[PDB]
Symmetry: C5
Subunit: 313 residues, 5 copies
Amino acid sequence: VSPPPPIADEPLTVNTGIYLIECYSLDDKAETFKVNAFLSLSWKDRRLAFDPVRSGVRVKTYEPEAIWIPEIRFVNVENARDADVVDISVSPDGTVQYLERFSARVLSPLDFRRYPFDSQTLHIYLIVRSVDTRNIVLAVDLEKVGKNDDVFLTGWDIESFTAVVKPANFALEDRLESKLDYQLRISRQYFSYIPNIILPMLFILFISWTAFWSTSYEANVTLVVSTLIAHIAFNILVETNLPKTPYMTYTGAIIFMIYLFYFVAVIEVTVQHYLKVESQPARAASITRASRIAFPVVFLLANIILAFLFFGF
Amino acid sequence: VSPPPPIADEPLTVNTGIYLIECYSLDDKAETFKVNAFLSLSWKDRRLAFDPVRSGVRVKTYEPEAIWIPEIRFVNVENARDADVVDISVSPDGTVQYLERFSARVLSPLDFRRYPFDSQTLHIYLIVRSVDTRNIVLAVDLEKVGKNDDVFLTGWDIESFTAVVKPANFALEDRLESKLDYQLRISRQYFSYIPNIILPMLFILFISWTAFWSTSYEANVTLVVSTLIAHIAFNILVETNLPKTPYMTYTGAIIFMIYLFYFVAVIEVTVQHYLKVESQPARAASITRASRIAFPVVFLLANIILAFLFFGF
Amino acid sequence: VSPPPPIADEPLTVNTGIYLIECYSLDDKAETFKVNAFLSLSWKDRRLAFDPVRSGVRVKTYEPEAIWIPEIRFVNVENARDADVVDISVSPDGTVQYLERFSARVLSPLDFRRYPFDSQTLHIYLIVRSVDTRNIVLAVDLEKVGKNDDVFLTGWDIESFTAVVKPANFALEDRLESKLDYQLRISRQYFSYIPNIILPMLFILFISWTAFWSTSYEANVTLVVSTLIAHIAFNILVETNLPKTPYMTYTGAIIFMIYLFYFVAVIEVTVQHYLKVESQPARAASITRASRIAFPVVFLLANIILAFLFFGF
Amino acid sequence: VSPPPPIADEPLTVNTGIYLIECYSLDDKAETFKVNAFLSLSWKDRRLAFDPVRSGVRVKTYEPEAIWIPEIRFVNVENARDADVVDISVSPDGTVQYLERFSARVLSPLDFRRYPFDSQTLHIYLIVRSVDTRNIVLAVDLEKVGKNDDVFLTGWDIESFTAVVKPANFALEDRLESKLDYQLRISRQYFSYIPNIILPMLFILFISWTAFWSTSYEANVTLVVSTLIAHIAFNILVETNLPKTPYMTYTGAIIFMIYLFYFVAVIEVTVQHYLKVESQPARAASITRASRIAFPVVFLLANIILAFLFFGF
Amino acid sequence: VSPPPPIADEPLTVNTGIYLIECYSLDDKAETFKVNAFLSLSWKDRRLAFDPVRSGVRVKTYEPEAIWIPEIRFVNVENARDADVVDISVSPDGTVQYLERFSARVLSPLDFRRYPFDSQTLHIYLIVRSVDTRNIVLAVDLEKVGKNDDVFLTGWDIESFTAVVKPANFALEDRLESKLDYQLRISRQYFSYIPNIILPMLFILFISWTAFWSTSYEANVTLVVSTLIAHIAFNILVETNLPKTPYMTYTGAIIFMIYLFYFVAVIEVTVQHYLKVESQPARAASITRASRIAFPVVFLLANIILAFLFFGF
């Protein structure tokens, strides 16, 4: 139970990789998801006398966990990973293929700035426990990293898992911490939201806009205010799906725009009624005719501007 | 505590089966349910010297857990199953009937594509721990698999449990993993939903449709918009029972159809009022008479089309 | 730590009883409640040499838990009961009075078919661990079963605890399992629900019924539809108290009846307006006068029929 | 590890007291709160040879937990208290001052019968573990009981903690159980509820009452029914703060009174409209003038009666 | 495992400091947040013979946890901190640099008196375990206290962590307890709340205020009451973001002011209608013209007064 002696006086290259098995239950509210995968490391200790016999009659040698194993810890996870050791084998004067089955509650933030069509990346970092004087450096093994076993999570389509970048950070000016980064690139399927969150609100707004084709003040007032109440009720209904973040959101500005449009519609209706009362029917009709075309065009232009602001640039 | 020597050089056939005892609390939101059942395996080790005495005076021999027992693990469950060993007996040069009482929080997905009348299947897979060189293959024992002990869960009617299929999958190109599949086929009782989720919404829509039999613009506007608000409030009320999935749902399209019908009704009322104002009473009456028959017929045809789309084909 | 030898070759009669101490927190949604009580068994082993000295100078002998104690397990509970041994004493060639203080989360179903005035029964079953060949049969000791220590739970009034029935069931055609049943008969106090769930809804319906004493179509429409919206809002407000079950409920049919009455009222108002427009004032007045008396009488008759259906028969 | 011999043949007086340190998070819904305090017992064993040396050179003697310590258990708490032993010292032929730091989730019921201005008392009972034949009786030590260390909990003002009563109860006719009662007397601060739960509802009711100063039937109907809907919505809004109990509540009857007032207002408006239609303007005006004064006076009288009923008597 | 002998007869100065690493998930409702940081103490024991060899060939000496380590406990946290020892080294006749990686659920109250623009301070206290007679006094080490490693939490901007004050409190008149205070000064970003909680309510109120520019009593009543209902619905919608405290809140008085304004608007509309009915059109017009200017000016003045009350003074 000791690190191999530094005869070469060089850090041991503990190559590692993760083969995803089954991931599910991505909770947006808690920013948590489950991960089940393989952990395959290939740390080599030839000078530790870990059976470097060089005997062909005893190839594929098997050893228990009595020898020291480089401990790997996940910074993201808040609980200890349930480890299940599978294979502990070393070749004659070769490397050790030590595999494990693990499940953990890995933590990762989310970016709800493009909520209907967002493209978050899922992060997993791991660290090594540097003990004694033998430096331990983590490398990337491209052979045993991937997810090609038909894994799926509802609402998303996986596209990449082999980012395998190594952003060696710093902490209290420490010597070295590799902190291998495993990026799980995912995208959201948006077809279930168009007829659920967007179209019902647009229909309510369009129902509101019909007040310009009438001349009854009571009917216009009832239409507009009851439509506003219906919009508030729908916003209450779809509160769970909508995200609540302390920053601006693309889906969080359309609602404010809708409120502004309701206020402007109320002001326009009141102005029309006042002008009609003050005996200016020609001016009232001109204002109504102008508004009929001004409202939807302004709405479309503002939506285009907001899309170009949040997306694109 | 060693696997039996492979004198025959063949994998040991560990026959197994599950006798359901009590299952309850199927939570649709978390896709979890409780299972209490028997686990009866019949693994045979004649060459392991596990009392193959062939003595009639000592039949029905009893042994403790000192001998090795093939460990069986459930991939679905997220926690260790509470095991209660009952019988450990071997016949002279026979097999071992090792029974257990277990309770676990087995996980399984659900398909909310036909929510009022869905027919989900409940999955349970188990795996064996291949140790040393003696291959372990899992088989199906039809004698001790079933649920015929008057087990019930509220809202469902069980119909089948003996699917006992063996879909041997692959993981990292491993040698063999039987992964026996235990399918619990269930169906939902829908009579408690017709007078709770469907009829109250249809009644609200029918109340909305009565606006075509009136000529008061203010009354029509109040009727339609307040009916829309009532529909939104009812949707809020029945949110818990309705499922929220990232895919299309049969019960998730009727609501969108209802919103579309409300929008079309508002447009029709506005058109009628505008035509009446513009001194076209004959055209207004013709439009109203046409709409009176066009609305329910179109609704019925669209419902039939949606039913033929989601169900049937 | 061995069962007493079957010198008489008869099963040992382990008499037992439960003296309730403090029960509280009956959660209807989770169908769970806390129970704190005494467990007093009187299993006798005279031939086990468990101090059958027959010495008057050493009466009321005290022994530790070194001797075997018949393990008692509760099938209902999902967790191990926190056991606190109090007295372990045997009389000379007598029985052992082994008492314990236990608290457990015992599970039991509920019948929400008469929710305002329901009379559920609370079930507790226990089983014995049959070991070796000495058969163990559970009996009922009427001396130490009861709750006469001023125990109360909010909202209910206890009436019986000494049902002490023994419904010996079967499981995989086993030899014997006594499975003593302890029925806790309780009833619900309904005076806090009449002015909270029933009267506010009846008042809303009565407010709706006043539309028949008016001739303004706009006023009638506003009254009826806004009353329907208020009823929906109240149903949302009292959702937590109301039960959600996959079967028919007495309180679950009155709501459907109320929706039907709202729909019929809307139809009647529309018919009256149409007849008045079509120049049939006498027929409109006759219809209104008939409806004024027909509505409450039909409502009362339907309520009586529903009461006779759910209750009584 | 044995109780002191009863040379005097008298029960040992284990004086005890609790010095509150920090209490917080009183959850009304779960009836739970956190308590951190000191536990100082002064049980004396002179005849147990627990260092009764009577040597002045070794005063303030220190001993470890090797000697037996009378176990103290809290019936209210559902979990074991995290104990932190601080001082274990005995004077020469004196007593033992054994102090501890403990934190527990102590349970206690609440009385929501005067919710805005309630004065609940917070209960803590403790019991002793009577072992062997040496009787253990719990007493009260007024020296080390109190809370004078500037402890506060939000929304309440503590007024008393030294009730230190000893209601020795009975359980299965046991010999003796002191069951010391520690009453924490608290009161609620009500100034944050007057402008949050009471005044907004009174304002809504007053808005409703303005219908008597108008003659438009449609306006009166809209006013009253929309005000009722607003009241229901506010009740939904303040549901969390309001308590839900299976008994009558002072704040639970004002709401029913408000519903009754809404119903009576609707009836009065309908009666006025019917009388005006039936050509009785003088009677309609007289009824309106009478109601204008009858409504607020009756409301005030009923509120006074309800206050005198729930409070006072 | 003994404290160093007090040869100097002076308390040992155990200097300590916390270097923040990663803090996140500040839950306002539960007043909890996660903290991951370094714990670096520099307690010195030269007279304890903890390798005071004064040998230059063995500088940077390494020792295991066999020697006693001063236990540090956090009063705020409700759970034991997960400790990970990193470095245990002593210089020849020097001090011990004992570092640890810890994560804990530290508790701290919040002041929701300026909720949109609040400036809470986050508190962390630690205590030492005084054992034997060697007094232990906690000091502050400014070298290893800070957060300069690019740590961020959503919605807040950290500004200070090195308060490192030492408010030595008292408990039962104890000798000494340093109770070092670590203040984490944070501020809230308010730009995400202006277009989400404030502007939508101001727009609703402004929509309400348009009733003064009309003469239709029915239209005015519908406008005002439906606007009030919409305001209640919005308050329900934004309930989660708003804080619920038993004391007055800046955001908790604006709502009451809005309710008062709605009530006054209803009263004004009723007064105008009554005066118009009683044939006083000049007085009605004068009242309307006065109110048009009186309402917004009074609202602005009251808002300024409330701001000067809660903020500033």
